[PDB]
Design a binder for this molecule. Structure first.
Ligand SMILES: Cc1cc2nc3c(=O)[nH]c(=O)nc-3n(C[C@H](O)[C@H](O)[C@H](O)COP(=O)(O)OP(=O)(O)OC[C@H]3O[C@@H](n4cnc5c(N)ncnc54)[C@H](O)[C@@H]3O)c2cc1C
Length: 455
DNA sequence: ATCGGCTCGCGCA
DNA sequence: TGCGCGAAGCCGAT
């Protein structure tokens, strides 16, 4: 807990007490891959300044990439190529390790005689597993910093929040303390495996790319990765799209969303930065309220969900009323039953669902509104709730650029299990889970135009 | 003990 | 297209 005027100590918490070593401060970067507006890197620099040592950044590439597609890999890697150059300009060296973070981070601390270890915060299961391994294998102090949420996850609330309307008041009460400008990253005054080689080695490791009847389906030109690109996407949203957001956010025929989720997922841009700029923008107040609710309440309540429910991707995490309902309807005759392969290919009877899948396959980002429709029909046309959850998670994390994310698990849990929702009218197969229909969409936007844009 | 109020479909201007 | 009601279980403020 070092000094600093803009260094709120509540953003940091110790994972391991220990004797501070004589070597550099190491920032094990995982979730927040950026140089600007990064509380984890800023704290690491602050601690370094106080101990008269340099700060270095270390990043561990795991074999997880093999589970989810070329498209996520290129986006991350191309971003990291930009990050390395950015950190070089500030005289901050970056090291890239390939292996199990459990093993590799421990050995790096020992070999480079690191004095203090800092990492960013993720509520996902696997990160806590790596952390506990690292703890068992080091002697130096080990700090965690929430660089992803405006209000630190463990400060916003101490329990799983049942609904946004109970969480909203708590989060906004803490905004005045935690919504603050970022100080500039001070360069080092003391002073890696080829990212280009990791790019090729693993891009060839993926022969199972999604193709077409043999042309590849992914279109990489829709989102340019990196920290610079993210800033441009933010500024064009404020300039051109924020004003209309309140009205057109749920019309998938209009590209009127922020398009920030891919950059937000990999932490190439801070949501605190986005919030700071949106707050100062003079736009329609209704649109502001709507957007802020999405990127503050719903984004950060998703971290709450995963942090306090370690089964966040299972039926157990559903609330009792949803479990009772879905259990009661397990034997109901489904009108249609499709396999993972058939959903994946877009071979259902519903042209709207198929179009949603085609947008996902081709762009890597399904519109917000149809994601709800998409997930809920998987529940409707699967043989069991467990199978639906599997299929939804599999397709989401495999094809969404912003997948493998708390927002994904919390969003699928809303669609299928009523997490952060309430009970609705009793139906068959879906019980009391909120229903969405083809006819409903027909009333809210030009379904025909969405279908034709994606075959 | 007890209400009020929560991010759909539907009928109607 | 925008509005007001319905159906439905529970949290938290009173
Ligand atoms: C079944 C399902 C799966 C989803 N999967 C993901 C996912 O894998 N990754 C992901 O980042 N989001 C997911 N979401 C939430 C939402 O769909 C996306 O965040 C949103 O579409 C991202 O596009 P955008 O930022 O251009 O939209 P915007 O309207 O510009 O929203 C801006 C930001 O607010 C946040 N946000 C918006 N909606 C939600 C939400 N429902 N929950 C949490 N945060 C939200 C996002 O951080 C988003 O980037 C999912 C929702 C559902 C219903």
């Amino acid at each position: 807990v070092p000094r600093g005027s803009h260094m709120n100590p509540k953003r940091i918490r110790a994972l391991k007490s220990g004797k501070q070593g004589d070597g550099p401060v190491v920032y094990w970067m995982s979730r927040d891959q950026r140089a600007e507006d990064n509380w984890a890197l800023l704290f690491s620099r602050a601690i370094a300044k106080e101990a008269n040592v340099p700060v270095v950044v270390v990043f561990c590439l795991t074999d997880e990439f093999l589970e989810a597609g070329i498209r996520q890999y290129e986006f991350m890697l191309k971003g990291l190529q930009e990050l390395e150059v950015s950190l070089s300009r500030k005289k901050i060296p970056s090291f890239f390790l390939r292996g199990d973070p459990g093993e590799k981070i421990s050995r790096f601390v020992k070999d480079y005689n690191a004095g203090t270890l800092v990492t960013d915060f993720s509520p996902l299961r696997i990160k806590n597993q790596w952390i506990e391994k690292v703890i068992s294998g080091i002697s130096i102090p080990f700090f965690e910093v929430d660089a992803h949420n405006v209000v630190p996850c463990w400060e916003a609330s101490q329990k799983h929040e049942y609904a946004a309307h109970t969480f909203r008041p708590k989060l906004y009460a803490l905004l005045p303390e935690f919504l603050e400008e970022f100080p500039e990253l001070e360069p080092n005054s003391v002073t890696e495996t080829l990212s280009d080689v990791l790019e090729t080695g693993v891009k060839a490791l993926l022969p199972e790319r999604a193709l077409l009847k043999k042309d590849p389906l992914f279109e990489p030109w829709h989102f340019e990765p990196g920290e610079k690109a993210a800033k441009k996407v933010m500024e064009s949203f404020i300039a051109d799209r924020l004003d209309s957001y309140g009205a057109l956010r749920n019309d998938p025929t209009k590209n009127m969303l922020s398009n920030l989720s891919p950059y937000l997922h990999f932490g190439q841009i801070s949501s605190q930065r986005v919030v700071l700029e949106v707050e100062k923008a003079e736009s329609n107040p209704g649109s502001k309220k709507a957007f802020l609710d999405e990127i503050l309440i719903w984004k950060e309540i998703s971290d709450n969900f995963c942090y306090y429910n370690p089964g966040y991707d299972g039926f157990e995490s559903f609330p009792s009323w949803a479990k009772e309902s879905l259990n009661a309807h397990r034997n109901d005759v489904r009108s249609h039953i499709y396999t993972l392969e058939e959903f994946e290919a877009g071979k259902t009877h519903d042209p709207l669902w198929n179009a949603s899948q085609m947008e996902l396959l081709s762009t890597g980002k399904m519109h917000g509104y149809t994601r709800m429709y998409w997930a809920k029909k998987i529940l409707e046309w699967s043989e069991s709730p467990e199978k639906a959850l599997e299929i939804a998670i599999c397709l989401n994390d495999r094809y969404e650029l912003d997948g493998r994310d708390p927002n994904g698990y919390a969003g699928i849990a809303w669609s299928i299990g009523g997490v952060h929702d309430r009970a609705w009218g009793e139906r068959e197969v879906t019980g009391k889970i909120r229903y969405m229909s083809y006819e409903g969409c027909k009333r809210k936007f030009d379904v025909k135009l969405y279908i034709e844009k994606y075959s």
